[PDB]
Symmetry: D2
Subunit: 253 residues, 4 copies
Amino acid sequence: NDLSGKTVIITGGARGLGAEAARQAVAAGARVVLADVLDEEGAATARELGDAARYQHLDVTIEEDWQRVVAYAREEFGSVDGLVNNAGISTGMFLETESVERFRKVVEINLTGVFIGMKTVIPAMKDAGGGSIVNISSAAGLMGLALTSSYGASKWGVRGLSKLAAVELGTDRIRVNSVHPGMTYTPMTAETGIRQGEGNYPNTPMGRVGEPGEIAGAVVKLLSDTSSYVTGAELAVDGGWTTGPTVKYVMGQ
Amino acid sequence: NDLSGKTVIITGGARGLGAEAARQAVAAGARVVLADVLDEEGAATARELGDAARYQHLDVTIEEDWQRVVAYAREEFGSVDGLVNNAGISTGMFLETESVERFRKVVEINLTGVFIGMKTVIPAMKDAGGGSIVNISSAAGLMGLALTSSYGASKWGVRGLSKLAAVELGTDRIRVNSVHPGMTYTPMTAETGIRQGEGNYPNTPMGRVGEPGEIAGAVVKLLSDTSSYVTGAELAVDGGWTTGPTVKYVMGQ
Amino acid sequence: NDLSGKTVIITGGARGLGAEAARQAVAAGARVVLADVLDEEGAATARELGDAARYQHLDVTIEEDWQRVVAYAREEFGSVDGLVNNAGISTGMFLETESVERFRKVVEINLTGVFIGMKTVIPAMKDAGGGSIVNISSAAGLMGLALTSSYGASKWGVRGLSKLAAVELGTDRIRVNSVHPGMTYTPMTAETGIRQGEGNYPNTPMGRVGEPGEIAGAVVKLLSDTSSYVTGAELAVDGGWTTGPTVKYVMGQ
Amino acid sequence: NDLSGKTVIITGGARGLGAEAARQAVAAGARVVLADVLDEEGAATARELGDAARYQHLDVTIEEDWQRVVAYAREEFGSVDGLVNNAGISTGMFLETESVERFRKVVEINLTGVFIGMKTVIPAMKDAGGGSIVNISSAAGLMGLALTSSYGASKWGVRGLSKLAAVELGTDRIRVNSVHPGMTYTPMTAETGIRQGEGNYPNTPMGRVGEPGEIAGAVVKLLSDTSSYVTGAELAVDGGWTTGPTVKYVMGQ
Ligand SMILES: NC(=O)c1ccc[n+]([C@@H]2O[C@H](COP(=O)([O-])OP(=O)(O)OC[C@H]3O[C@@H](n4cnc5c(N)ncnc54)[C@H](O)[C@@H]3O)[C@@H](O)[C@H]2O)c1
Ligand SMILES: NC(=O)c1ccc[n+]([C@@H]2O[C@H](COP(=O)([O-])OP(=O)(O)OC[C@H]3O[C@@H](n4cnc5c(N)ncnc54)[C@H](O)[C@@H]3O)[C@@H](O)[C@H]2O)c1
Ligand SMILES: NC(=O)c1ccc[n+]([C@@H]2O[C@H](COP(=O)([O-])OP(=O)(O)OC[C@H]3O[C@@H](n4cnc5c(N)ncnc54)[C@H](O)[C@@H]3O)[C@@H](O)[C@H]2O)c1
Ligand SMILES: NC(=O)c1ccc[n+]([C@@H]2O[C@H](COP(=O)([O-])OP(=O)(O)OC[C@H]3O[C@@H](n4cnc5c(N)ncnc54)[C@H](O)[C@@H]3O)[C@@H](O)[C@H]2O)c1
């Protein structure tokens, strides 16, 4: 089913979701390339992953870093079959509050970054007769989420980017889809005081926050050939956060 | 790698989409109950599946039936863990041309039908501590498709009914999502003029209609625990059809 | 500035959003034909509305009344230029707690009833050289709302069905759009527990339920020639109910 | 009808949609502050609009410029009651074809430009007790349109920026909606061979391209109190371009 024999570059794979996806894909047969700004950790992720993994330094906003890392894959593995655009920075504040400078920063990573990744990897995949680009968006890209400011703007952008890219590359067998994670447990969200566990996140239909491995599974599905006719699609992995409001809220929560 | 060891019932499982979902389910371990109105074929398909498959006549618009085949799976197999609502019919005419007689018929099978399946298996799956209901909607449920009238109206109804159900059953570990396949090659479509293969369906970004086995892959995945944090979702398997207009169309020509 | 000088039929016209529209639609100078099953109230309403109004009986489920009423509007006013599909019933219970007979009766009125209206009115408006059909869907037809069961199903139904009719009738200059009202104060919802007034409904961005006049104004925008290039569109009037979750919910309501 | 006895600022006011909105707003009784980079044409227009029009130079990507113009608007007309974020630039090329510096250029204006717009203008609106921000998006922000690249990513970003702002500014009585015009008759499109007139646009359900005033009419609606309950909505003025493919395309023609 969801098996591999390909080379997938994972951006933001030094930690959290990115590493998890790497771990899962390597565990599925793919040879991965981790790319992050977090070097020390990254190589540590690679080193633990095994021989199917290499770590590469990559600043998602620098076209040259992309060009170099994409090239490193073709050389070091023979091809580039998958791209998982995960690297990004978040926002937790009201619109008027956010500085235009920071707005611009966040939008650079989250949006313009996946674009540089796309246009850059596209030729390598054309070279390989098709490929899969999985754009990790957010639940903030599926509905208006209070307090996401620049992050909301950029996750909506990634959703349209995937879609229009999907219609342009279909004939080249280049698949492009977006995955949308809801509240996930990570030491970082743990720092927000987010508790993992059934009953611990009542404001999402499933009453709980998700796990990194849960989102990682859907990334692999879209990397595998079991989804050979899926493109310009959006997959929400949020325990129903974006589907509709919690019952309690429909009454008075 | 989406696995199984549970019992799932596949409505509309005689021929086409249903049968292949049944097929793929079995190859992953699931115990399947092909329910259908088409008794001869459906019985043969179960025959071709093996011991992992039971057939059951079921006219989806009959509450009594659903209660019977669910009961049967319960007794026959010890549980109900998956329900793939695929048994529908189709509308191939303009709205002003259609008779309220056919409209009622299409809606009744395509919409009310899945409602009953859902209302019936819910306790079955509460007893099992969770489940997965995959309502097979269509591209007609994701946009306005000319010539689908009742089939389309009912497919939007089915997309929506999947969502409100997901918010109510989240806490019960029951997961409702919708699969929306595009143009599939079927001897009927073949007859209706549909050619299978590359460049054989230019009016979809990917340039071809999908093989029935390409949809089935997506159904099996949402049935699996690989997607445990996935509810109130809508997956489209249509080679870009529903994402946006084809380049040529964007240009006119 | 929205103005009308044409004939328009409003279903569910005896009261609520329906009658409010009739008032405003006459204020804009249209000739309205109210239609309802509540004939006592209905005639009374048309009386208060004056001479630009005519009450006709219409059991939205009986294709005959549609014909009788559509024949009348044309003969009494020479043309049928608008149709506001407002008649409908509600649902407030957990899905698996709704009988299939009720499920069916609600769909019949909310879904098929708008269909019979579209088909019947089409030729009439074609003879008039165009027209405007406004289907009063719901905020329940824009996301998965809990406890709406049948009402949800049909509302998603009414939304998708407007889109195909829009694509089909676009060249006949017959415009079709759907209006989606969120929580609104109507004496019926009063007999629900709903309150009109500031902060009285904290679970929608704006803080309170809307008034009937807020909805009618929109229906009239789309019923007018100001929205001449508008078809296949969905206008939510719900104080952001549908737009995304409330700031409080977003933080741990 | 829609009356606007208030003061609203229009970006990209020198020409096109911006201008046609200015005329209709001033006609609705609004006091207008046109803003743009094209000082030459901008001045002329304001003049031709009357003593209810003022032209302010404003480069949409510069905060000082915004800070300046909104201030001037407060002094001059005593308040800021509306904002139509219309300034922007387009794109006509394949993603893999467009440069990073260009992508940036375009995002900055269409997305970042609207952010600084909203941020700056919010305090003025709280001051007044409410307001209406109309973010002019595009059909490109509602689906995957090929060749829009940076324009498409930014118009999708604008769609979600508006929705999040609306959840956060609900109780402040500041409404935020997105207008999404499709193909429009404009000498720009005209140089492209786009002919105005019925039948002249096959690939849109309505069989033709729209006029600026058709879109200008929706702006005045959202800006007016007539839409006091609309927030976080999206309105497509596009002849059904976004609601499913054209019948011909459905029939594989
Ligand atoms: N719970 C969540 O954290 C959550 C919620 C919703 C959506 N998501 C999406 O899932 C993705 C992964 O979530 P996460 O918690 O693992 O995030 P994370 O922040 O823990 O990890 C993402 C990685 O991106 C890296 N990165 C940042 N800037 C970079 C740059 N410019 N170049 C290269 N790499 C860079 C970071 O250094 C980090 O290690 C996120 O990007 C987010 O958009 C996450
Ligand atoms: N245009 C299309 O055909 C199309 C496109 C996309 C998705 N789909 C989806 O798949 C289904 C149609 O299935 P298909 O295309 O594989 O072929 P199909 O139309 O042959 O349907 C599959 C089965 O449903 C059965 N069925 C009909 N009425 C039934 C009833 N009342 N009770 C039980 N079973 C019944 C049929 O006999 C058949 O065995 C629909 O549910 C639809 O959502 C269809
Ligand atoms: N009020 C809200 O908050 C709200 C929200 C979303 C959607 N809606 C929808 O708006 C429409 C009605 O709004 P309302 O507030 O005026 O409600 P209402 O029910 O108070 O009044 C509308 C009318 O529907 C009529 N009706 C029912 N069956 C009929 C039939 N068979 N033939 C003819 N008329 C029939 C009733 O007689 C009634 O006069 C319905 O579709 C409702 O579902 C209302
Ligand atoms: N063919 C079209 O013109 C067309 C069609 C559909 C949608 N749209 C969209 O609708 C809006 C207006 O369309 P239009 O028909 O008026 O097109 P237009 O390009 O003639 O007008 C856009 C205006 O933005 C101004 N502008 C650019 N950068 C600016 C900045 N930095 N600060 C201030 N002003 C700036 C331009 O100089 C121009 O006057 C745009 O956002 C556009 O994306 C345009």
